[PDB]
Curated annotation (Swiss-Prot), chain A:
Segments forming a coiled coil: none
Function: Mediates NK cell adhesion and triggers NK cell effector functions. Binds two different NK cell receptors: CD96 and CD226. These interactions accumulates at the cell-cell contact site, leading to the formation of a mature immunological synapse between NK cell and target cell. This may trigger adhesion and secretion of lytic granules and IFN-gamma and activate cytotoxicity of activated NK cells. May also promote NK cell-target cell modular exchange, and PVR transfer to the NK cell.
Other notes: The V-type domain is necessary and sufficient for virus binding and uptake.
Domain-level remarks: Contains 1 copy of a cytoplasmic motif that is referred to as the immunoreceptor tyrosine-based inhibitor motif (ITIM). The phosphorylated ITIM motif can bind the SH2 domain of several SH2-containing phosphatases.
Glycosylation sites: N78, N93
Family per record: Belongs to the nectin family.
Disulfide cross-links: C22-C96
Induction pattern: Transcriptionally regulated by SHH.
Residues included from the entire protein: 28 to 142 of 417
Quaternary structure annotation from Swiss-Prot or TrEMBL: Can form trans-heterodimers with NECTIN3. The extracellular domain interacts with VTN, CD226 and CD96. The cytoplasmic domain interacts with DYNLT1. Binds with high affinity to TIGIT.
Lineage: Eukaryota, Metazoa, Chordata, Craniata, Vertebrata
Name of the gene this protein is made from: PVR
Domain Ig-like V-type: 1-112
Organism: Homo sapiens (Human)
This protein's name: Poliovirus receptor
Modification note: N-glycosylated. N-glycan at Asn-93: Hex5HexNAc4. Phosphorylated by Src kinases on tyrosine residues in the ITIM motif upon ligation. Interaction with TIGIT is required for Phosphorylation.
Curated annotation (Swiss-Prot), chain B:
Region (Homodimerization) location: 9-19
Full-protein interval shown: 24 to 126 of 244
Extracellular side: 1-103
Residues annotated as glycosylated: N9, N78
Organism: Homo sapiens (Human)
Domain notes: Contains 1 copy of a cytoplasmic motif that is referred to as the immunoreceptor tyrosine-based inhibitor motif (ITIM). This motif is involved in modulation of cellular responses. The phosphorylated ITIM motif can bind the SH2 domain of several SH2-containing phosphatases.
Protein name as catalogued: T-cell immunoreceptor with Ig and ITIM domains
């Protein structure tokens, strides 16, 4: 089975940067295709951060987000997300999601703790 | 930003067929992939590139289409309940529609 | 000769709602000439294979074509309740008819 | 409007032939397009004879029907149908139908009464 590995929580320092780590573990014996990476605030439907296999990355919250691993022309496995200059208003749950075929969606909730 | 229409809340006859269907409007976003799922199960996927995949549990009693919609065959009371179409799109992300079935 | 029609099921929706209506015709290699969406009382719309879509004037403001040969009904009202028919005019087979019952509030 | 005109009832003797006239009356001032003509026994799906604007005429398993008045490459207005070697099973009601755009379907029912 394809399985997302992430911590359940991540402490960051106000005004500092931090990375939300999110990784897809794909067995060698198993066959899969990942089409995109989607980040959102837990509950909400849409993408704060999205990386697509052909279109590359697209952050929507602002230029305070970055896909640290994902690159075009390379298999998508690491959806790790960097957030610059965190705000009290950044504390919350987040969802890292892998858009795979034929397994379907693999996702996790990561808690971001500011201060 | 964009809105999903569905076939809504519908009824059908034991042993008959039904179309499950969604439309994603009010947005230019590309559809990367559509997942047809119940709360804890994956019925199928229509991937723009790779095409259709049907879950083994539903393979012999389900047909792809029309379009991104899914056709349930030989309905059983067990097939009653919530269904979801999840659109995975760029650059918007994830859109979700609910359909309720009463067999 | 053979040809079946699956439908999107008999609905029960609510006021202000949007609903999709759709049929699919199968078990036949017959070519579709045109699809007519109507009620015994009147014609909602028509998707003709060469001429594209036509929407009856008193539905134009609250009916979107598609998806496919289906129809999207907008701003439901209690009046919208009733039978609904998709009629496939096909060759060489002839006519197939599927029925959908909508109920609003 | 575009109105289909045809007789309410038509008689035919056993062992003989008969024509079921069905015609689409279209005002000079109105715009329509007729894509297909369909005959079928009244009240049932499918067809009996079909005439398509490109594919021509088809006959659902007969050898005893013919579109007397309709050709490829001219406006589709006459659905008039002819039955050969009438039989007692041919007694019955039949729907003649024009498939048009934007007006939709125009049809009539016709009682074929077979005599001896
Ligand atoms: C498992 C994996 O490949 N993910 C890596 C992680 O191990 C690494 O530490 C991080 C940057 O430090 O970026 C990502
Ligand atoms: C503040 C916040 O968003 N964190 C929540 C926490 O309150 C909650 O108890 C838990 C439930 O799974 O998930 C996380
Ligand atoms: C109205 C029309 O054009 N239909 C004609 C009809 O006039 C004629 O009598 C018939 C041959 O008997 O063929 C057809
Ligand atoms: C062939 C056929 O079905 N024609 C019917 C006939 O059976 C009946 O006498 C009448 C019913 O009132 O209507 C007409």
């Amino acid at each position: 089975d394809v399985v997302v590995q992430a911590p359940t929580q991540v402490p960051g320092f106000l005004g500092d940067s931090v990375t939300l780590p999110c990784y897809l573990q794909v067995p060698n014996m198993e066959v899969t295709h990942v089409s995109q990476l989607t980040w959102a605030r837990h509950g909400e439907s849409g993408s704060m951060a999205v990386f697509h296999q052909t279109q590359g990355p697209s952050y929507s919250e602002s230029k305070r987000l970055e896909f640290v691993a994902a690159r075009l022309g390379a298999e998508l496995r690491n959806a790790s997300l960097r957030m610059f200059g965190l705000r009290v208003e950044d504390e919350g749950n987040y969802t890292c999601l892998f858009v795979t075929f034929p397994q379907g969606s693999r996702s996790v909730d990561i808690w971001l703790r500011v201060l | 930003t964009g809105t999903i229409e569905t076939t809504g809340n519908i009824s059908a006859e034991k042993g008959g067929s039904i179309i499950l269907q969604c439309h994603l409007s009010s947005t230019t976003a590309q559809v990367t992939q559509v997942n047809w799922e119940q709360q804890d199960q994956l019925l199928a996927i229509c991937n723009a590139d790779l095409g259709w995949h049907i879950s083994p549990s539903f393979k012999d009693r389900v047909a792809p289409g029309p379009g991104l919609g899914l056709t349930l065959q030989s309905l059983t009371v067990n097939d009653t309940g919530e269904y979801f179409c999840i659109y995975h799109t760029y650059p918007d992300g994830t859109y979700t529609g609910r359909i309720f079935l009463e067999v």
